[model samples]
Structure formats: C-alpha cells, structure tokens
Target chain A: AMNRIEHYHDWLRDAHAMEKQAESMLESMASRIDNYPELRARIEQHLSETKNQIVQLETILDRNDISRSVIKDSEIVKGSISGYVFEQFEIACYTSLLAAAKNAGDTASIPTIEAILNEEKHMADWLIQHIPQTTEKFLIRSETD
Target chain B: SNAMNRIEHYHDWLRDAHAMEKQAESMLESMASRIDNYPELRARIEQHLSETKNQIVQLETILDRNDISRSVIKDSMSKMADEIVKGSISGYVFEQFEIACYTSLLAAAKNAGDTASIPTIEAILNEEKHMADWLIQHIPQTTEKFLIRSE
Candidate 1:
C-alpha cells in the first residue's frame, strides 16, 4: 500500500540508520587496527565522511518532513575483511536508495544520494585494492610475533 | 607459525569459500525466479547462477584434493515493488562479497603455500569482479527501467 514517495522516505531513514551504524563500526574497527596504519587512516577518513553522510541523510529526511525516530541500529562483525564486506553492502544500499529516490520523483535528493554512493564505492575500492597487501602484512606479523 | 598450522588455517578458509558459493547458488535461484521483468537482469542472474554452480564444484575439487572436509557453517533476500533495483543491488553486493571471500582465500592459500589452488581461486575472483562491475554499471539503466515500468 505504500506509495513511491513513502517508500523513498522510508529508505532515506534506513540510510540514516545505516550510516550511524557504519560510523560506530568504523570507529571500533579502526581503533583496533594498530598495525595496519594505512588501513586505519583510510577508515578514519571514511569515518569522517560517514558522519557527514549521516547529516546529509538527516537533512533530506527533514526536508521531506519524515521522522528520524524510526531508525533501527544493527551490529557488524569487526575485522578488515568484514569492513570490506560492509563497504560493498553500503554501496548497494545507496544504489537502491538512489533508484528509489528517482522512482519517487524526488529529484532534489538524487544528487545527495549519488554523492554518498560514490563515497561508498571509493571505500570499497580502496579495501579491495589493499586486500592482498593487508593479508600479506597480517601473515608476516602472525609469523614473526 | 608451523606449516601444518598454516595449512589448517587455509583449509578452514577453503571450506568457508565452498559454503559461501553454495549459499550464492540458492540466492541467485531465488532472485532469478522473481525477476519477471528486466530480461537482461534475469538473464545475467541465471548466467551467474550457472557460474556459481561451477564455482562450487571448483571449490569442492580444491577441498577434495587437499583432503579438507567442508565446514558445516554456511554463510547466509527480497523480491520487490522496486524489484529490479533491489535485485541488482543485491547482486552487486553479493558479488563484492564473493570477491572479498576469494581475495581472502587467495591470501590464506599463499600463507599456506598452497600454490596449486591459486590459479583456480584467482579465476573465480575475476568472475566475481566482472559480475560486480556489470551490476554496478547497469544500475542506473535498471533504475530507469523501474521508473518506466512503475509509471
């Protein structure tokens, strides 16, 4: 029974919650990544962007007069590999949201959502690019220590 | 630190990769059935479904060769009003997940000195990357189609 606009609002709220959860997960995971300085630095940078993304989603929700109270938080397992997995998950989330926004004819929100989507894609790419070296470093550390 | 320990760890990841592909097979079947529109998307899903089956067998071959038993733990989707967008997004997400899995497996294999499995794992990883790239590339077009159909 939900209309396209309603669905779009709902997805926006869901995106807001996703960003909040991602921020928490990144903070926790980044803190634990002591040896992997490059990974940790990238995560911290993304963490800042995630915060801005949350604000952006909130702005969209506010403009639509949608309540942010409906957000439901979720937990993510911690690790660099898990971090990479979640980045991909987030990219899909924004991709769907962008589609939903367009389908709803919410033109104002599309660019914002696209920006967020690009940030997630960038993060996922970084994770993928570094996976081989990260794994090698982990193995070396494991053997030496 | 020892060779045996490294191989054991690698076996564990290989088993995980096998279980992951099994789950992908089921997920793709379910997605393919619900996609009545978007012939291109559905066709791609079916194609990937076939690839997923072969990937499962490939994983099993590697496992069998190494005398490793598959793990019991399986890594664990929706149809839609916005079905095309949802399915495409899920497809891309799962493809990326599969990529990460293979990337990790290749690392583990290297750590274990399992050189024989590297070529097979790399091949599967490439397929995953290609699928992900395809899904991402088509998402905007898929969204356009959704808008047209729904209107």
Candidate 2:
C-alpha cells in the first residue's frame, strides 16, 4: 500500500543504515591496516567522506519526514578485496536509490545521491587500481617476515 | 613452486567464476519468470540469462583446457510489484561483482602464465560490463514502470 514517495523514503532510510554500516566497517579497517600505509590513508580519507555522506543522508531523510532505522548491517572484514566489493555494493545501492528518487519525483535528493554514488565509484576504482600493488606488498611482507 | 602456487590460485579463481555464472543463471531465470510488467527489463534479464548459460560453459572449457579440477561451491524472489526494483538492484550488484571477479581472475591467469584463458576471461568480462551498464541505465525506467503498475 506504499506510494512511490513512501517507497523512495524507505530506500533513503535503507541507504542511511547502509552508510552507517559502511562507516563502522571502514573505521575498523582503517585502524587495523598498519602494514599498508597508502591503503590505510585512502581508507581514512574515505572514512571522513563516508561520515559526511551519512550526514547528507540524514539531512535528506529529515527533509522528507522519514526517520532512519537504528539497524546497522556490516561485518568487520578484509582491507582491499572486501573493500572493493563493498564499494561496488554501495555503488549499486545508490544507483537504485537514485532511480527510486527520480521515479518518486524527489528531485531534491538527486544531487546528493549522485554525489554519493560518484564517491563510491571513485573508491571502487581506487581499490581496483591499487589491488595489484597491495597484493605485491603483502606477498613481499609474507616472504620477508 | 611459486608458479605452481600461482596456477593453483588461478584454478581456484576459475572455479569461483564458474560457480558465479551458475548462480547468475539461476537468479536470472527466476527474475525473468516473475517479471511480466516490464517487458524491456524482462527481455534484458532473459538475454543475459542466455549469456550467463554460455558463460558457464566458457568457464568449464577454461577449467577443462587447463586440466584443473573445479571446486564445488554454488549458491531468490519477490513481492510481484516490489520485486522488480529489488531484482534489478540485486542483478546490477552481482554484475559489478562479476566484473571484479573476472578482473581478478584475469590477473591471476596472467600471473600463472595461463595465456589460453585470457581471451575467454576478457569476453566474459565485457559481457558483465555490458549487463551492468544496461541495468544501471534502465533502473530508473524499471522503477517508473513498477510505480505505474503499483498505482
């Protein structure tokens, strides 16, 4: 019985919970990544951006009269491969939410969704590009130590 | 020994890719069957289903040609109206996941000197990229159709 706007609002809250989980996961991974400085630095940088994203989602939810769910969904996981996959998942989440927003004519949230989607794509791209180096560094460390 | 280790890793990845396509085929079939309202979206899912079947075969061929034994690991549906949006999102995410899978597999093949598998991996990678692009591009339209029908 939900209308388009309601459905869109539901998805916005879903995005908010998802970003919250992402913030937790990234925070944990950033602190644990002592061996990979560049990777750690990037994660730290994105952690800041992700906090901003959570705020953005919160603002949108507030304007729409929707309350974010308290449920945070994430398991503490790996640094690079899991991060890469999670970024892709985040990208898909935003991509779908953008469609839902457009369908509901929630034009006010479109730019915010687009910005967050771009950040996810950027992080995914960075993870993909640096995967080889990350693996090489791991291999070297394993062999030497 | 390192080359052997690399080859073993490549085989593991190839098996993972094989299992991934198998799972994709099943998911697409279920998705395509339930989608009656959105013809374009259904058609795309069906088309990709066909591609997915072929991809499984392609992966099998790679494993067979390399004489690597596959590991056994393989692994949905909906409210008829809300299902479309959920399915499209799930499909798009899996397509992106497949792209990452193949990208890593291709790197593994190269590291293992598995030249014969590169072209096949590249072909599958392109299909995944195409499907992901299509899903992302059409998600808005799919949502639109779902809303119209729900009303």
Candidate 3:
C-alpha cells in the first residue's frame, strides 16, 4: 500500500495541514492590522481561496480512492515537522521524475516539472525566510492564552 | 493654485501608470505569440491575448479618458517579460506572478481611494482574475499530466 499510495496520501495530509496553517495566519494577519482595509480584504479573500484549496485536495484524494480523515499522531506530527518536509518531498518527487523523463526522452514534461520544482523551491524559501517571526507571533499568542 | 496642484499630481500619476500599461501590453503580445509553442495551452491563451491587447488599448483610453498623457513603458516591460519567459518558469507560475502583481496594484488603487482610477484598476483586477481562473482550471490536469508523463 505504501508503494502506490502512502506517499501521496501523506502528502495530502501535509497539504491540508499547510492550508490550515495558512488560514490561521490569515486570521492572525486580519486581527494584527487596523485601518488597512485593502490588505485586510486580500487576506480575507485569500482565506476563502485557501479553504477552497482544502476541498479541492480532498476531492483529489477521494478521486484517487484514498481514505479521508483517518489521520493520527504520526500523521499530525509528520505534518507539523517543519513544513520543509513537504517542500523537500516535492523536490524529490519532481526531481526523480525529471531525471527519469530526461533518460526516457520525455520532453513534454520538461516544462511542467521544472515549473513545479520552482514552486516547491519557492515555498521552502518563503518558509525559511518568513516562518521564524511567523511562529514567534503564534508562540506569543499561545503564551498569552 | 489648488486646482493646478491637483491637476499636476494626477498628470504625473497618469504618465507613470500609462507608461507601465504600455509595457504590459507589449508583454501581452510577446506572451501571446509564445502561446503557439504549447499547443495544448494555446487555445486557452488565444482569447486572452486579444483581451490583453484590448487591455493595453484600454490603458491608453483610460489615460485619454482622464485627459492624461499615455505612458507605454514599452522597452522596460519587454525587457522584463523577456527575462521571465527565458527563465525556468511555466505558464502557471507566470500567471501566479501576474495575479500577485495585479493584487499589489489593486491594493495601491484601493488605498489611494481615487474615484477616477477605479475603472482602470478594475480592468487590471478583472484580467488578473481571468488569468488566475484559467490557471486554476488547468492545474490538476495540466501540471499533473506533465508530471506523470515525466515519470
């Protein structure tokens, strides 16, 4: 089962977790600023977008005949373990495919894989760049409560 | 003096925005031309190419409507678009960048709260949404298929 399904299934879990974290960030951002109406509205709009993304992911999982909502401690821990894990996994996923494509003379995928690879790199870069202060804010809130 | 000052301010803003719009139009053309290279995606962007050209004209018309001189920063936009196209980015990534760019400008217009600029901003807003929608429509199949083939 792990061979055909575990990887993507676990990925979907992380993806869902990231979406939840993104929505949380959006809320914190909406509350953190005042009198910045446009920024607030963008954040609000994107929150909805993120929520839709969750549904889309779930739909994909369902379509693939993967089970939904059976995640447990190992999964949650996996999800929370420095979102970089997903980024790395994405890179590995695409890189391995890309190498195979190159070897097999599959040119059609060159563009798409390269594109997604860049997105993964960017996601990791952003997390490395911004997640520090982001987590600090979260920690502060947790402390207050 | 008060009237002249406001006019002066708007004229400058109009000049800058118009210049940038012109540049973006050139980009739309260049990007549209490259559409044929990806047959699977060409039909999707063909309509947008026309829409984008119109948007360029609309950008000028907006300035004309506002009685401001046109600002088609042609060379600058060409330079930028060329670099981006040559880079390791795909249509989806480019659209994502476009969405972000439009959102930034939309925020600017919203913050300025200038009634005169609303229509122009709305045009950008609409196109950005259209491109983003197109990108979303293709994501699952477009990128996914490519990855599968790659493997």
TM-score of chain B of each: 0.89, 0.89, 0.60
lDDT of 3 by residue, B1-151 (tens): 1334334434454464545445555655666675433454556566666776676666666567656665346436534641222211244444444443343334334433456766776776577568745654554444344434434
Please identify model 3 stretches exceeding 4 Å from their true place: A1-145, B1-24, B35-40, B72-117
**Judged by DockQ, which candidate is best?**
2
| Per-candidate interface DockQ score | 0.38, 0.41, 0.04
What is every candidate's alpha-carbon RMSD to the true fold? 4.0, 4.2, 14.0
lDDT (tens digit, per residue) of candidate 2 on B78-145? 11216778778888888977887777776667766789889999999999999999988898777777
lDDT of 1 by residue, A14-113 (tens): 7788888899998998888877788889999999999999989888988888867453744111276789878988887787777677777778988888
Model 1 residue A98 CA deviation in Å: 3.0
Worst 10 residues of 3 chain B by lDDT: B82-91
Q: Estimate each model's TM-score.
A: 0.85, 0.87, 0.42
Which structure is stronger by DockQ: 1 or 2? 2
Per-residue lDDT tens digits for candidate 2, residues A28-84, read: 888788777888899999999999999999899888887887663331112577788
- lDDT tens per residue, model 1, B47-151: 999998999888888988798777764443111215567668777877887888788778778877789989999989998988998888788778767665654
Q: Which ten residues in a row are the worst by lDDT in model 2 chain B?
A: B72-81
